[PDB]
Structures are given as structure tokens and as C-alpha cells.
Write a protein that binds this ligand. Structure first.
Ligand SMILES: Nc1nc2c(ncn2C[C@@H](CO)OCCP(=O)(O)O)c(=O)[nH]1
Ligand SMILES: Nc1nc2c(ncn2C[C@@H](CO)OCCP(=O)(O)O)c(=O)[nH]1
Ligand SMILES: Nc1nc2c(ncn2C[C@@H](CO)OCCP(=O)(O)O)c(=O)[nH]1
Ligand SMILES: Nc1nc2c(ncn2C[C@@H](CO)OCCP(=O)(O)O)c(=O)[nH]1
Ligand SMILES: [Mg+2]
Ligand SMILES: [Mg+2]
Ligand SMILES: [Mg+2]
Ligand SMILES: [Mg+2]
Lengths: 192, 188, 191, 191
């Protein structure tokens, strides 16, 4: 499954709640915060359906997108809360030999080209894990794609630079809970 | 007109969201996920404080149904009043009325179909001489009355989930989804 | 008797409180989150004792709608994971079809117990199958007639509380915590 | 302020929502999940008042306590969301240079002996940040303490081994949302 597909055919900024200091820094809102949560909940169910059998090593990729790792884990925890079974789980943050013979879940916020995840997978596999599966919230339909496709995808978004929820721009838009396309005004205002 | 959901867009495939297993064959598509509703409802609260709130607000919920939306909408409204340095008094009430005279009356509805409910309701409310009468409807069914505040404009399909029910079923369904012919015959 | 708050709450400066309500409160008895956690368990106690026959949830007016909405949400949450289509009736009543029904009366606060005793007397003449009362708050008061609800959220001291579901002359609705009103705020918002 | 003080002098398990597979693994619930959130919300406000405004560096200490770090930041980001000002913020993790000239906030889940923090504070202060302040969800009231006190304290708990929310035990109890006292059955089952 390609996940929730958003074609090239989001929302107007006036239809949702937006921080006033970001009003001119955004073009449109692609994915409202609540829509992310609902999809993330289903993602957690998909993961726990196949991977959630026993002990899980959930790896968060750093840096950028910790909010998605936190929310995904909460939904996963909520499922364990009603499983009639005490299930242990390892939670760590990649940027070692603990992964050997484990069910590893790599969690990423966004995959653009796919170079990051391809490098990361070719390194985790250098050890001896039972299996490595990757769950990503966002996946760009970009011509810059190397070809990689995650095992779990939340949203498939157009090839536009997005901010909000878990994605920041020079450590801005962290208080922005919606996934939104940055504008040239915001891109320039928050330049490093 | 609010968040428009056109006829040509299919909505959301049931495979993409969390749905009660007992409602699996009873739904066709998910139009509006629960989180989408809350986000839109949050903005609607801001729109209410924009045009209203200059005077004492009387929040009117209409029975039956839509109490869930009335509850959520007021929560966002009360949240806006929390960040104010002024203690805002607000009156809540439920109808099928002397309290309305000289007040800003907000009639909260979950869905508008034929529009006959609101037309009959408006006329009676403005008889009691309010300072302002406005209507907040979560859903407007594309089936000559237009609300002041609209959450979503949905196609002509019988929807259930979130505040909306069918023979008191689908109350546990948090998403606004289109009912199927199976579910229609099932819970008739 | 549910969570017991003895005569022996919290300081206002330890929680998130509306600045305009600073002088109007003495103490915070029950933070909003603590209400939610207890309400969640209450909903399970209801399903374990009333989830046998179709439930007619009756909300008592005025006040207590917020507790009614939250209680139902946790109830509906249990129905989602039941793998069964469970129909539920919701309705409202005031200071005044139920025959052979499993009726759940939802109240926010029981003080003297006169309201519920009167209500229960009225409902039982329609001859329902079962009547049970779930109250969020129950006061330890000498003015109590002796009535005890089937489901209790919190047993609180004999103090006039506001917040969450309880208002005072249409004030304190934005207050999410159950808190004791002060003489300052009570005289400030008097009608 | 010493934070919300829980005396040695908690809540019964039968009053709150608790997973069935942890039933015999717990003695008593000290802090329900919702109570934590209400307190964490106030802490975030204290933080933003005192060290907020401009740029801060949020450091989470590994391992454990990521949950409290996530929730505290959510409340912080909620504050910045309604501030009418674009506030930048660094989020980072560290396990025992960018910090220099910045407002460093160390976020801990629990402080017991205080050996972890005094060591951590000494290292961070070497890089001459503009200031270093520490927010701990739980401060364990114990004579084993070195005498260190955080700038921000959520709860001052008795000297009992607690699990839940952000405190795990051999990677168990991660699904437990309430801070509860572990039993001997659970301390041996998850050995
Ligand atoms: N804020 C923001 N950052 C982005 C975006 N696209 C790429 N990046 C850069 C980083 C952010 O984590 O991701 C690259 C993943 P890779 O191309 O597969 O190696 C974007 O739309 N928004
Ligand atoms: N569950 C469900 N109920 C509906 C729907 N359309 C109409 N109704 C009937 C009721 C529901 O509250 O509303 C009527 C509004 P009116 O025709 O303008 O007076 C629908 O799509 N779903
Ligand atoms: N806001 C507020 N109102 C209260 C309180 N105690 C009593 N009341 C009045 C009403 C309910 O609002 O109590 C009637 C229940 P009964 O005495 O058992 O018949 C209180 O602490 N706060
Ligand atoms: N699950 C649990 N773990 C604890 C507890 N007390 C200490 N620890 C261990 C670790 C944190 O997990 O404490 C280090 C802080 P320091 O002792 O001040 O240097 C406790 O009550 N529960
Ligand atoms: Mg990332
Ligand atoms: Mg209606
Ligand atoms: Mg009442
Ligand atoms: Mg720690």
C-alpha cells in the first residue's frame, strides 16, 4: 500500500487554526494535525499486526521527526495496554550490537530521495537483526527518488517542501502542528 | 462554504484508518476522519469568537444527535476563553426560552439536509428578541438555507459516525463515514 | 465510595489555572486529568454492571453535561473494541418509553441527595427494567438524606466546588479542574 | 517550589484503569496519567516564563524518560503556538558546543540519588551556556540523595520504586500510563 495518497490535483490556511506568526510563512496546509494522528493510529496497528508479535526495537532516526516517533509509540503502547500480555520493547535513537537477532522497527518522519534510509538500512543490516522494517510518515513523489519504498507509509505527498508537526525549518515551525507547504516568505525569513 | 468535499473525490479508503471491526461491511468510504473534524471544529470556535462573543453567548444544542459536536465545539470555545484575561460568562442549553432575550444565540447543529429543521428553529428563536442569532453546522449536505458557520460540505450520501447515528448505531464510530446498503439493511 | 478526598486538594500554583480565576478560588480538589482517568474506570464499571441490556443514558440538567459527554466517550471506546455492534440510547431530563429499559442516570454532583431521590421515584413509576445512577461527585455532608449512588467518581468534602461540569452563575465554565470557590469569587459573580 | 508533594502518610488499583497483565505486578498507583499531564502542563508554563521567550535547547537524558520529554515539549509548543512570535527551539538527546550561549533545559523523568544530574550539570556548564536549568518529573524523597534540587519539579514522591508513564522496568511497563509502585511479583516476573 502507498498509504494515504495526496495527488497534485491540501487546504486553504483560513479553514484551520494557524499560529499568527506563520500566517505569511505558509502556502497551504497539506495534512492537518488530527488527520496525521488518525493515520498514525492505523500505522501502529499495521506494525503491531505483523511486527508486534514479541519484543520490538523501535529506532528513531535523528535528527528531525521525533514527534512522529513519540505519537506512533503512544498508539503502539495503547495497543499493548489491551493485549492481555506484557510485551517488552526497546526504544533507542540512531544518528549498536543490540540489534543482533531482533525485530527492528526504523521510524522516519519523511523520505524524500531515499538516500538516508538506504544508507541506514545498509548499515543496520551489517549486524544480524531478525528483520528490519521501516515506517515513514511522509513519502515524496519526487523525480529525485533513488527507488526505495518503506514497508509502512503514512502519507504520499507531492514534491513540495513541507513543514510542521515533526518537520522543522532551521528549528522553526515546531509549534506548527499541521503539515504545511512553506512559502518563499517563510523560507527567507527563517534562513540560517 | 467551509471545507468542501466534492463528488469526484472518493474520500478515504477504509483500509487506511482505524475502524471498528463490527462496522467493516457497514461502511463504504471514510469522508472525514475524527482528527480532521476536531481540527476544523477548532477553527470554527475561532470564527464564533470573531463574530460573536461581543455579548453573552447562549449555546443551543438541538436534540437528538449532534451532542458530540456540541460538546467538542464548546471545549474549543471554552479553551479560547481560558487564554483571555477576562472571565467570560456563557450559557449552555438544550432545545427540542426567556434566557435568549438580549443575548448572542449560537444554534449548534451536526448536519443540515433539507434545511427544514433550522428554518423552523430560527423563526422561533428570533421571536424571543435576541441580540444575534447564528447557526454552526458541522456538516452541510449537498442535497436554500446556508449556515453562518460550516465545518464540512459533503455530497448527498447518508453518513454515520461522530455524533451521527443510525437507529442508535455507529455511536462508537469516531469518523464520519458513508453507510453501505448492507449496514442500512442490517441496522434498520 | 470511589476516590476519597478527606477533610485532611492542591495549591493553585501547582496547576494550569485561568488568570482571571486566580482570586476566585481557594484550592483545586480534582485536576481535569484526574477526572478523566477516574471517569475511564467508571465507564468500565458501568459496562460490567449495565452492559447486559440496552442502555438508556439519561443526562440530568442543569449542569453535568461535560461529565455526561466524557463518560459516554469512554463507554463508546469500550464498545469499539467489543467486536460487536452495540446500540445506545441518549437523552436528557430536567425538573419534571423507559419501561423495561436498562437506564443509566448520569449526574455531576450529589449533595443532599434530594434531587436523585426525587428523580428515581419519578423514573421507577414508568416501570423500567433497571435504574442505576452514576455521579461524578458525592459530598460528605451532614445535610445528606442518606442516598448513595451506584457509581461514584469522587467523594469530596463539604465545600462549594466549581469547574469542569459545575458553573456559578454561568461562570467558571472554562475552568477544567474541580476547585473550591472563594468568598471573593462567589461575591464577585453573584447574581 | 518543591512541586506536588506526595507524603509517606496513594490510590487503590481498583479505582483506575490498569492493564490486566500488570494486575499483580503493582502495589499502589501514586500518580494517574491525567494528573501527570495537568502538572506537566503547568511546568511547561513555568519553563516558558522563566527561561522561555527566546531560543532554548531541550536536552533529553538517555536512557528512559523520553515520554515526559515528549509531553512537556508538546505543552511548550502549545504555548509558542499562541504567542504571536516565531520561537526557535533545539531538541536533542544525550547519553552519559551547540549549547554555548544558549538557554539549556535538561529534562529528566526521575531524580533519585542525584548523581546523574550533578555529573551532567558539571559537563554542560563547561561549555559556558548562558544558563542551565533542570526539569524533573519525579523527585524521589530519599536520604540517599546528594541534596540536589531541580529548577522545576513535577512530583516529590516517597522512597518507593515506581514504574509507569515514562519509567520502565527491564523494558516492561512501557504501556503503563500511570506512575505506580511495583510489587514483588512484578519485580521477579520481569527480572
Ligand atoms: N523540513 C523538511 N525537510 C526535508 C524535506 N524533504 C527533505 N528534507 C530533508 C530531510 C529531513 O528529515 O530529509 C531528507 C530525507 P532523504 O532525501 O530521503 O535523504 C521537506 O519536505 N521538509
Ligand atoms: N445519520 C444521518 N442522519 C441524517 C443524514 N441526513 C439527514 N439526516 C437526518 C438528521 C440527522 O441529524 O438530520 C436532518 C437534518 P434536516 O433534514 O435539514 O432537517 C445523514 O447523512 N446521516
Ligand atoms: N456548582 C455547585 N453546585 C452545587 C454544589 N453543591 C450543590 N450544588 C447544587 C446542585 C447541583 O448543582 O446540587 C443538587 C444536588 P442535591 O443537593 O443532592 O439534590 C457545588 O459544590 N457546586
Ligand atoms: N523505574 C525506576 N527507576 C529508578 C527509580 N529510581 C532510580 N531509578 C533509576 C534511574 C532512572 O531510571 O535513576 C537515575 C537517577 P539518579 O539515581 O538520581 O542518578 C525508580 O523509582 N523507578
Ligand atoms: Mg527525519
Ligand atoms: Mg441534527
Ligand atoms: Mg447536576
Ligand atoms: Mg532518566
Amino acid at each position: 500500500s502507498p498509504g494515504v495518497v495526496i495527488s497534485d490535483d491540501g487546504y486553504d490556511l483560513d479553514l484551520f487554526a494557524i499560529p499568527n506568526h506563520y500566517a505569511e510563512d505558509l502556502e497551504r496546509v497539506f495534512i492537518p494535525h488530527g488527520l496525521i494522528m488518525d493515520r498514525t493510529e492505523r500505522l501502529a496497528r499495521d506494525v503491531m499486526k505483523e511486527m508486534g508479535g514479541h519484543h520490538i526495537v523501535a529506532l528513531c532516526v535523528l535528527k528531525g521527526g521525533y514527534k512522529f516517533f513519540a505519537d506512533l509509540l503512544d498508539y503502539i503502547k495503547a495497543l499493548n495496554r489491551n493485549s492481555d500480555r506484557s510485551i517488552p520493547m526497546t526504544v533507542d535513537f540512531i544518528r549498536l550490537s543490540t540489534l543482533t537477532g531482533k525485530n527492528v522497527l526504523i521510524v522516519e518522519d519523511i523520505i524524500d530521495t531515499g538516500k538516508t534510509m538506504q544508507t541506514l538500512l545498509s548499515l543496520v543490516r551489517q549486524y544480524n537483526p531478525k528483520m528490519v522494517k521501516v515506517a515513514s510518515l511522509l513519502v515524496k513523489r519526487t523525480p529525485r527518488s533513488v527507488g526505495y519504498k518503506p514497508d509502512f507509509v503514512g502519507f504520499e505527498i507531492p514534491d513540495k517542501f513541507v513543514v510542521g508537526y515533526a518537520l522543522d525549518y532551521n528549528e522553526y515551525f515546531r509549534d506548527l502542528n499541521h503539515v504545511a507547504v512553506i512559502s518563499e516568505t517563510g523560507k527567507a525569513k527563517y534562513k540560517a
